[PDB]
Amino acid sequence: ATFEIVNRCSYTVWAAASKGDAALDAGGRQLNSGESWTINVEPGTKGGKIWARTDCYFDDSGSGICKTGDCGGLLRCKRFGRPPTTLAEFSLNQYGKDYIDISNIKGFNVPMDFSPTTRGCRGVRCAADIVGQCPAKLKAPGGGCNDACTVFQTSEYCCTTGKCGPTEYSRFFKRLCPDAFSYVLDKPTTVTCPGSSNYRVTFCPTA
Ligand SMILES: Cc1ccc2c(c1)sc(-c1ccc(N(C)C)cc1)[n+]2C
């Protein structure tokens, strides 16, 4: 499938795409305000994620650091990034269907729209000012709003026993972005699309 990744933010982001144990396409790229990056993701990919990273510094060998979403110091991500990271998540061609969602389970750094560019389903979006409204205990040192699991490392926030409920922190994310996962057992906001659809991920969709 084809994913177009568009930075509509007024600031530069460094996009990333990975399935956890491997890069998706090149794995990462600088996107200045307005730039688009088209990647190809192999059909059948399960557990793919796309995210933005902010305030990065890379040397000429693609090595460095980002204040949000860093994937072990690399420009071309092979692994997932450090929270906080708004997440576009997807699994393609699973029994004839694509599954997409946005998740705030690992916090939020940049607003995002995740939409098909082919027929047959709707997109999802989380574009509220989560960073502006972020509870004080969840604010990150480098911009962004962490999830409660990352900050407090409890069974209830991280849902480690597989039994857990919504929380005060959970409900904050859910209230600003009802279409995104707010905690591990949140009622799914997954969207089902036809197998082999194509997609656009837009950072800072409203502008
Ligand atoms: C950027 C920024 C701004 C404020 C801010 C943070 C980061 S992190 C933080 C904080 C986090 C945890 C706690 N406790 C668990 C007691 C108390 C305060 N504040 C208040």
Coordinates of N, CA and C and ligand atoms in Angstrom, one line a residue:
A1 N 0.9 -1.2 0.0 CA 0.0 0.0 0.0 C 0.9 1.3 0.0
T2 N 0.3 2.4 -0.4 CA 0.9 3.6 -0.5 C 0.4 4.5 0.6
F3 N 1.3 5.1 1.4 CA 1.0 6.1 2.4 C 1.7 7.4 2.0
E4 N 0.9 8.5 1.8 CA 1.5 9.8 1.7 C 1.5 10.5 3.1
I5 N 2.6 11.0 3.5 CA 2.8 11.6 4.8 C 3.1 13.1 4.6
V6 N 2.2 13.9 5.0 CA 2.2 15.4 4.8 C 2.4 16.1 6.1
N7 N 3.4 17.0 6.1 CA 3.5 17.9 7.3 C 2.9 19.3 7.0
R8 N 1.7 19.4 7.6 CA 1.0 20.7 7.5 C 1.4 21.6 8.7
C9 N 2.2 21.2 9.6 CA 2.6 22.0 10.7 C 3.5 23.2 10.2
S10 N 3.5 24.3 11.0 CA 4.4 25.4 10.7 C 5.8 25.1 11.0
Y11 N 6.1 24.0 11.7 CA 7.4 23.6 12.1 C 7.8 22.3 11.5
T12 N 9.1 22.1 11.4 CA 9.7 20.8 10.9 C 9.4 19.7 11.8
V13 N 9.0 18.6 11.2 CA 8.9 17.3 12.0 C 9.8 16.3 11.2
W14 N 10.2 15.3 12.0 CA 10.9 14.2 11.4 C 10.0 13.0 11.5
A15 N 9.4 12.6 10.3 CA 8.5 11.5 10.3 C 9.2 10.2 10.5
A16 N 8.5 9.2 11.0 CA 9.0 7.9 11.2 C 8.0 6.8 10.9
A17 N 8.4 5.7 10.4 CA 7.5 4.6 10.1 C 8.3 3.3 10.3
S18 N 7.7 2.4 11.1 CA 8.4 1.2 11.7 C 7.3 0.2 12.0
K19 N 7.7 -1.1 12.1 CA 6.8 -2.1 12.6 C 7.4 -2.7 13.8
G20 N 8.3 -2.0 14.5 CA 8.8 -2.5 15.8 C 10.1 -3.2 15.7
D21 N 10.3 -4.0 14.7 CA 11.6 -4.8 14.6 C 12.1 -4.5 13.2
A22 N 11.6 -3.5 12.5 CA 12.1 -3.1 11.2 C 11.5 -1.8 10.7
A23 N 12.3 -1.1 10.0 CA 11.8 0.1 9.3 C 10.7 -0.2 8.3
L24 N 9.9 0.7 8.0 CA 8.9 0.6 7.0 C 9.5 1.6 5.9
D25 N 9.8 1.1 4.7 CA 10.4 1.9 3.7 C 11.7 2.4 4.2
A26 N 12.0 3.7 4.0 CA 13.3 4.2 4.6 C 13.3 4.4 6.1
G27 N 12.1 4.3 6.8 CA 12.1 4.4 8.2 C 11.9 5.8 8.8
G28 N 12.4 6.9 8.1 CA 12.3 8.2 8.7 C 12.8 9.2 7.7
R29 N 12.3 10.5 7.8 CA 12.7 11.5 7.0 C 12.4 12.9 7.6
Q30 N 13.2 13.9 7.3 CA 12.8 15.3 7.6 C 11.7 15.8 6.7
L31 N 10.7 16.4 7.3 CA 9.6 17.0 6.5 C 9.6 18.5 7.0
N32 N 10.0 19.4 6.2 CA 9.7 20.8 6.5 C 8.3 21.1 6.3
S33 N 7.8 22.3 6.8 CA 6.4 22.7 6.6 C 6.0 22.6 5.2
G34 N 5.0 21.7 5.0 CA 4.4 21.6 3.7 C 4.9 20.4 2.8
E35 N 6.0 19.8 3.2 CA 6.6 18.7 2.4 C 5.7 17.4 2.6
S36 N 5.7 16.6 1.6 CA 5.1 15.3 1.6 C 6.1 14.2 1.3
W37 N 5.9 13.1 1.8 CA 6.8 11.9 1.7 C 5.9 10.7 1.3
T38 N 6.2 10.0 0.2 CA 5.3 8.9 -0.1 C 6.1 7.7 0.2
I39 N 5.5 6.8 1.0 CA 6.2 5.5 1.2 C 5.4 4.3 0.7
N40 N 6.0 3.2 0.5 CA 5.4 2.0 0.2 C 5.5 1.0 1.3
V41 N 4.4 0.4 1.8 CA 4.4 -0.5 2.8 C 3.9 -1.9 2.2
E42 N 4.6 -2.9 2.5 CA 4.4 -4.2 1.9 C 3.0 -4.7 2.4
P43 N 2.2 -5.3 1.5 CA 0.9 -5.9 1.9 C 1.2 -7.0 3.0
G44 N 0.2 -7.1 3.9 CA 0.3 -8.0 4.9 C 1.0 -7.5 6.2
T45 N 1.5 -6.2 6.1 CA 2.2 -5.7 7.3 C 1.3 -5.6 8.5
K46 N 1.7 -6.2 9.6 CA 0.9 -6.2 10.8 C 1.6 -5.3 11.9
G47 N 0.9 -4.5 12.6 CA 1.5 -3.7 13.6 C 2.5 -2.6 13.1
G48 N 2.1 -2.0 12.0 CA 2.9 -0.8 11.5 C 2.4 0.5 12.3
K49 N 3.4 1.4 12.5 CA 3.1 2.7 13.0 C 3.8 3.8 12.3
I50 N 3.1 4.9 12.2 CA 3.7 6.1 11.7 C 3.5 7.2 12.8
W51 N 4.6 8.0 13.0 CA 4.5 9.1 14.0 C 5.5 10.2 13.6
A52 N 5.3 11.4 14.2 CA 6.2 12.5 14.1 C 7.2 12.6 15.3
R53 N 8.3 13.1 15.0 CA 9.3 13.5 16.0 C 9.6 15.0 15.9
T54 N 9.8 15.6 17.0 CA 10.0 17.0 17.1 C 11.4 17.3 17.7
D55 N 12.0 18.5 17.3 CA 13.2 19.0 17.8 C 14.4 18.0 17.8
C56 N 14.7 17.5 16.6 CA 15.7 16.6 16.3 C 17.0 17.2 15.9
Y57 N 18.1 16.6 16.1 CA 19.4 17.0 15.6 C 20.1 15.7 15.2
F58 N 20.4 15.6 13.9 CA 21.1 14.5 13.3 C 22.4 14.9 12.7
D59 N 23.5 14.1 12.8 CA 24.7 14.4 12.1 C 24.6 13.8 10.7
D60 N 25.7 13.9 10.0 CA 25.7 13.4 8.6 C 25.6 11.9 8.4
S61 N 25.9 11.1 9.5 CA 25.6 9.7 9.4 C 24.1 9.3 9.9
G62 N 23.2 10.2 10.1 CA 21.8 9.8 10.4 C 21.7 9.5 11.9
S63 N 22.6 10.0 12.7 CA 22.6 9.6 14.1 C 22.5 10.9 15.0
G64 N 21.7 10.9 16.1 CA 21.4 12.1 16.8 C 20.4 11.9 17.9
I65 N 19.5 12.9 18.1 CA 18.5 12.8 19.2 C 17.2 13.7 18.9
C66 N 16.0 13.3 19.3 CA 14.8 14.1 19.2 C 14.2 14.2 20.5
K67 N 13.5 15.3 20.8 CA 12.9 15.6 22.1 C 11.6 14.8 22.2
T68 N 10.9 14.5 21.2 CA 9.8 13.5 21.2 C 9.9 12.5 20.1
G69 N 9.6 11.3 20.5 CA 9.5 10.2 19.5 C 10.8 9.6 19.1
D70 N 11.9 9.8 19.8 CA 13.2 9.3 19.4 C 13.2 7.8 19.3
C71 N 13.8 7.2 18.2 CA 13.9 5.8 18.1 C 15.3 5.3 18.2
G72 N 15.8 5.4 19.4 CA 17.2 5.1 19.7 C 18.3 5.8 18.9
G73 N 18.0 7.1 18.6 CA 19.0 8.0 18.1 C 19.2 8.0 16.6
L74 N 18.3 7.4 15.9 CA 18.5 7.2 14.5 C 17.5 8.0 13.7
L75 N 17.9 8.5 12.5 CA 17.0 9.2 11.6 C 16.1 8.2 10.9
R76 N 16.6 7.1 10.5 CA 15.8 6.0 9.9 C 15.4 5.0 11.0
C77 N 14.2 5.1 11.5 CA 13.8 4.3 12.6 C 13.6 2.8 12.2
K78 N 14.1 2.0 13.1 CA 13.9 0.5 13.0 C 13.0 0.1 14.1
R79 N 12.9 0.9 15.2 CA 12.1 0.5 16.3 C 11.1 1.7 16.6
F80 N 10.2 1.5 17.5 CA 9.3 2.5 17.9 C 9.9 3.6 18.7
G81 N 9.2 4.7 18.8 CA 9.8 5.9 19.4 C 9.4 6.1 20.8
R82 N 10.2 6.9 21.5 CA 10.0 7.2 22.9 C 8.8 8.1 23.0
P83 N 7.9 7.8 24.0 CA 6.7 8.7 24.2 C 7.3 10.1 24.6
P84 N 6.5 11.1 24.4 CA 5.1 11.1 23.9 C 5.0 11.1 22.4
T85 N 4.1 10.3 21.8 CA 4.0 10.2 20.4 C 2.6 9.9 20.1
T86 N 1.9 10.8 19.4 CA 0.6 10.5 18.7 C 0.9 9.4 17.7
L87 N 0.1 8.4 17.6 CA 0.4 7.2 16.8 C -0.7 7.0 15.7
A88 N -0.3 6.9 14.4 CA -1.1 6.2 13.4 C -0.7 4.8 13.4
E89 N -1.7 3.9 13.6 CA -1.5 2.4 13.6 C -2.2 1.7 12.6
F90 N -1.7 0.6 12.1 CA -2.3 -0.1 11.0 C -1.9 -1.5 10.9
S91 N -2.8 -2.4 10.5 CA -2.5 -3.7 10.0 C -3.2 -4.0 8.7
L92 N -2.4 -4.4 7.7 CA -2.9 -4.5 6.4 C -3.2 -5.9 5.9
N93 N -4.3 -6.1 5.1 CA -4.6 -7.4 4.5 C -4.7 -8.5 5.5
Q94 N -5.5 -8.3 6.5 CA -5.8 -9.3 7.5 C -7.1 -9.8 7.2
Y95 N -7.2 -11.0 6.6 CA -8.4 -11.6 6.2 C -9.2 -10.7 5.3
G96 N -8.6 -10.1 4.3 CA -9.2 -9.3 3.3 C -9.5 -7.8 3.7
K97 N -9.1 -7.4 4.9 CA -9.3 -6.0 5.4 C -8.1 -5.3 5.9
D98 N -8.1 -4.0 5.9 CA -7.2 -3.1 6.5 C -7.8 -2.6 7.8
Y99 N -7.1 -2.5 8.9 CA -7.5 -1.9 10.2 C -6.6 -0.8 10.5
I100 N -7.2 0.4 10.7 CA -6.5 1.6 11.1 C -7.0 2.3 12.3
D101 N -6.2 2.9 13.1 CA -6.6 3.7 14.2 C -5.6 4.8 14.5
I102 N -6.0 5.8 15.3 CA -5.1 6.7 16.0 C -5.2 6.3 17.5
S103 N -4.0 6.4 18.1 CA -3.8 6.1 19.5 C -3.1 7.2 20.3
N104 N -3.6 7.5 21.5 CA -2.9 8.3 22.5 C -2.4 7.5 23.7
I105 N -2.3 6.2 23.5 CA -1.9 5.3 24.6 C -0.4 5.6 25.0
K106 N 0.4 6.1 24.0 CA 1.8 6.5 24.3 C 1.9 8.0 24.3
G107 N 0.8 8.7 24.7 CA 0.8 10.2 24.7 C 0.5 10.8 23.4
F108 N 0.8 12.1 23.4 CA 0.5 13.0 22.2 C 1.6 14.0 22.1
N109 N 2.0 14.2 20.9 CA 3.0 15.2 20.6 C 2.5 16.2 19.5
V110 N 1.9 15.6 18.4 CA 1.6 16.4 17.3 C 0.2 16.0 16.9
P111 N -0.7 16.9 16.4 CA -2.0 16.5 16.0 C -1.9 15.9 14.6
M112 N -3.0 15.1 14.3 CA -2.9 14.2 13.2 C -4.2 13.8 12.7
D113 N -4.3 13.7 11.3 CA -5.4 13.1 10.6 C -4.9 11.8 9.9
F114 N -5.6 10.7 10.0 CA -5.2 9.5 9.3 C -6.4 9.0 8.5
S115 N -6.3 9.2 7.1 CA -7.5 9.0 6.2 C -7.1 8.2 5.0
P116 N -8.0 7.4 4.5 CA -7.8 6.7 3.2 C -7.9 7.6 2.1
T117 N -7.1 7.4 1.1 CA -7.2 8.2 -0.2 C -7.9 7.3 -1.2
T118 N -8.4 6.1 -0.9 CA -9.1 5.3 -1.8 C -10.5 5.1 -1.1
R119 N -11.4 4.5 -1.9 CA -12.8 4.3 -1.5 C -13.0 3.4 -0.3
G120 N -14.2 3.6 0.4 CA -14.7 2.5 1.2 C -14.6 2.5 2.7
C121 N -14.2 3.6 3.3 CA -14.2 3.8 4.7 C -13.8 5.3 5.0
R122 N -13.9 5.7 6.3 CA -13.7 7.0 6.7 C -12.4 7.1 7.4
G123 N -11.9 8.3 7.7 CA -10.6 8.5 8.4 C -10.9 8.9 9.9
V124 N -9.9 9.0 10.7 CA -10.0 9.4 12.0 C -9.0 10.5 12.2
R125 N -9.1 11.2 13.3 CA -8.4 12.4 13.6 C -8.3 12.7 15.1
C126 N -7.1 13.2 15.5 CA -7.0 13.8 16.8 C -6.2 15.1 16.6
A127 N -7.0 16.2 16.6 CA -6.4 17.5 16.3 C -6.7 18.6 17.4
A128 N -7.0 18.2 18.6 CA -7.2 19.2 19.7 C -5.9 19.6 20.2
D129 N -5.9 20.7 21.0 CA -4.8 21.2 21.6 C -4.5 20.4 22.9
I130 N -4.1 19.1 22.8 CA -3.8 18.3 23.9 C -2.5 18.8 24.7
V131 N -1.6 19.4 24.0 CA -0.4 19.8 24.7 C -0.7 21.1 25.5
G132 N -1.5 22.0 25.0 CA -2.0 23.2 25.7 C -2.7 22.9 27.0
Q133 N -3.6 21.8 27.0 CA -4.5 21.6 28.0 C -3.9 20.5 29.0
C134 N -2.7 20.0 28.7 CA -2.2 18.8 29.3 C -2.1 19.0 30.8
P135 N -2.6 18.0 31.6 CA -2.4 18.0 33.1 C -1.0 18.1 33.4
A136 N -0.7 18.8 34.5 CA 0.6 19.3 34.9 C 1.6 18.1 35.1
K137 N 1.1 17.0 35.7 CA 1.9 15.8 35.9 C 2.2 15.0 34.7
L138 N 1.4 15.3 33.6 CA 1.7 14.6 32.4 C 2.6 15.4 31.4
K139 N 2.8 16.6 31.6 CA 3.6 17.5 30.7 C 5.0 16.9 30.5
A140 N 5.5 16.9 29.3 CA 6.8 16.3 29.0 C 7.9 17.5 29.1
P141 N 9.1 17.1 29.2 CA 10.2 18.1 29.3 C 10.6 18.7 27.9
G142 N 10.2 18.0 26.9 CA 10.5 18.5 25.5 C 9.2 18.6 24.6
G143 N 8.2 19.2 25.2 CA 6.9 19.4 24.5 C 6.1 18.1 24.6
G144 N 4.8 18.2 24.4 CA 4.1 17.0 24.4 C 3.5 16.6 25.8
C145 N 2.5 15.7 25.7 CA 1.8 15.2 26.9 C 1.9 13.7 27.0
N146 N 2.5 13.2 28.0 CA 2.7 11.8 28.2 C 1.4 11.1 28.7
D147 N 1.3 9.8 28.4 CA 0.3 9.0 28.9 C 0.6 8.7 30.4
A148 N -0.3 8.3 31.2 CA -0.1 8.0 32.6 C 0.8 6.7 32.9
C149 N 0.8 5.8 32.0 CA 1.6 4.6 32.1 C 3.1 4.9 32.0
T150 N 3.5 5.7 31.0 CA 4.8 6.2 30.9 C 5.2 7.0 32.1
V151 N 4.4 7.8 32.6 CA 4.8 8.6 33.8 C 4.8 7.8 35.1
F152 N 3.7 7.0 35.4 CA 3.6 6.5 36.8 C 3.9 5.0 36.9
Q153 N 3.9 4.2 35.8 CA 4.4 2.8 35.8 C 3.6 2.0 36.8
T154 N 2.3 2.1 36.8 CA 1.4 1.3 37.6 C 0.7 0.3 36.8
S155 N 0.3 -0.8 37.5 CA -0.6 -1.8 36.8 C -1.9 -1.3 36.3
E156 N -2.5 -0.3 36.9 CA -3.8 0.2 36.5 C -3.6 1.1 35.2
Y157 N -2.6 1.9 35.2 CA -2.4 2.8 34.0 C -1.8 2.0 32.9
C158 N -1.0 1.0 33.1 CA -0.4 0.2 32.0 C -1.2 -1.0 31.7
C159 N -2.2 -1.4 32.5 CA -3.1 -2.4 32.2 C -2.4 -3.8 32.1
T160 N -1.4 -4.0 33.0 CA -0.5 -5.1 33.0 C -1.3 -6.4 33.4
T161 N -2.3 -6.4 34.2 CA -3.0 -7.6 34.5 C -4.1 -7.9 33.4
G162 N -4.2 -7.1 32.4 CA -5.2 -7.3 31.4 C -6.6 -6.8 31.9
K163 N -6.7 -6.4 33.2 CA -7.9 -5.9 33.7 C -7.6 -4.5 34.1
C164 N -8.3 -3.5 33.6 CA -8.1 -2.1 34.0 C -9.2 -1.3 33.6
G165 N -9.4 -0.1 34.2 CA -10.5 0.8 33.8 C -10.0 2.1 33.3
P166 N -10.9 2.9 32.8 CA -10.5 4.3 32.5 C -10.1 5.0 33.8
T167 N -9.3 6.1 33.6 CA -8.7 6.8 34.7 C -9.0 8.3 34.4
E168 N -8.7 9.1 35.4 CA -8.7 10.5 35.3 C -7.8 11.0 34.1
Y169 N -6.7 10.3 33.9 CA -5.8 10.8 32.9 C -6.3 10.3 31.5
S170 N -6.6 9.1 31.4 CA -7.3 8.4 30.3 C -8.4 9.3 29.8
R171 N -9.3 9.8 30.7 CA -10.5 10.5 30.3 C -10.2 11.9 29.7
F172 N -9.0 12.4 30.2 CA -8.6 13.7 29.6 C -8.3 13.5 28.1
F173 N -7.6 12.5 27.7 CA -7.3 12.3 26.3 C -8.6 12.0 25.5
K174 N -9.4 11.1 26.1 CA -10.7 10.7 25.5 C -11.6 11.9 25.3
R175 N -11.6 12.8 26.2 CA -12.5 14.0 26.1 C -12.1 14.9 25.0
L176 N -10.8 15.1 24.8 CA -10.3 16.0 23.7 C -10.3 15.2 22.4
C177 N -10.0 13.9 22.4 CA -10.0 13.1 21.1 C -10.7 11.8 21.2
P178 N -12.0 11.9 21.1 CA -12.9 10.6 21.3 C -12.6 9.6 20.3
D179 N -12.0 9.9 19.1 CA -11.7 8.9 18.1 C -10.4 8.2 18.2
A180 N -9.6 8.5 19.2 CA -8.4 7.9 19.4 C -8.4 7.0 20.7
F181 N -7.7 5.9 20.6 CA -7.5 5.1 21.9 C -6.9 5.9 23.0
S182 N -7.6 5.8 24.2 CA -7.1 6.6 25.3 C -6.4 5.7 26.4
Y183 N -6.7 4.4 26.3 CA -6.0 3.4 27.2 C -6.2 2.1 26.6
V184 N -5.4 1.1 27.1 CA -5.3 -0.2 26.5 C -6.7 -0.9 26.3
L185 N -7.6 -0.9 27.3 CA -8.9 -1.5 27.1 C -9.9 -0.5 26.7
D186 N -9.6 0.6 26.0 CA -10.6 1.5 25.6 C -11.5 0.8 24.6
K187 N -12.8 1.2 24.5 CA -13.7 0.7 23.5 C -13.1 1.0 22.1
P188 N -12.9 0.1 21.2 CA -12.1 0.3 20.0 C -12.6 1.4 19.1
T189 N -11.7 2.2 18.6 CA -12.1 3.2 17.6 C -11.4 2.8 16.3
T190 N -11.2 1.5 16.1 CA -10.5 1.0 14.9 C -11.5 1.2 13.7
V191 N -10.9 1.5 12.6 CA -11.7 1.6 11.4 C -11.3 0.5 10.4
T192 N -12.3 -0.1 9.8 CA -12.1 -1.2 8.9 C -12.2 -0.7 7.5
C193 N -11.2 -0.9 6.7 CA -11.2 -0.5 5.3 C -10.9 -1.7 4.4
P194 N -11.2 -1.6 3.1 CA -10.9 -2.7 2.2 C -9.4 -3.0 2.2
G195 N -9.1 -4.3 2.0 CA -7.8 -4.7 1.9 C -7.1 -4.0 0.8
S196 N -5.8 -3.6 1.0 CA -5.0 -2.9 0.0 C -5.4 -1.4 -0.3
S197 N -6.1 -0.8 0.7 CA -6.4 0.6 0.5 C -5.1 1.4 0.5
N198 N -5.2 2.7 0.1 CA -4.1 3.7 0.3 C -4.5 4.8 1.3
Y199 N -3.5 5.5 1.8 CA -3.7 6.3 3.0 C -2.9 7.6 2.9
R200 N -3.4 8.6 3.6 CA -2.6 9.8 3.9 C -2.6 10.1 5.3
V201 N -1.4 10.3 5.9 CA -1.2 10.8 7.2 C -0.8 12.3 7.2
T202 N -1.7 13.1 7.8 CA -1.4 14.6 7.8 C -1.1 15.0 9.3
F203 N 0.0 15.6 9.5 CA 0.4 16.3 10.7 C -0.1 17.7 10.7
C204 N -0.7 18.2 11.8 CA -1.4 19.5 11.9 C -2.4 19.7 10.9
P205 N -3.4 18.8 10.8 CA -4.4 18.8 9.7 C -5.2 20.1 9.7
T206 N -5.4 20.8 10.7 CA -6.2 22.1 10.6 C -5.3 23.3 10.6
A207 N -5.5 24.1 9.5 CA -4.6 25.2 9.1 C -5.0 25.8 7.8
Ligands
LIG1 C1 7.3 20.8 31.0 C2 6.7 20.4 32.4 C3 6.0 21.4 33.1 C4 5.5 21.1 34.4 C5 5.6 19.8 34.9 C6 6.4 18.8 34.1 C7 6.9 19.1 32.9 S1 6.5 17.2 34.9 C8 5.6 18.0 36.2 C9 5.3 17.0 37.4 C10 5.3 15.6 37.1 C11 5.0 14.7 38.2 C12 4.8 15.2 39.5 N1 4.5 14.3 40.5 C13 4.2 12.9 40.3 C14 4.5 14.8 41.9 C15 4.8 16.6 39.7 C16 5.1 17.5 38.6 N2 5.2 19.3 36.1 C17 4.5 20.1 37.1

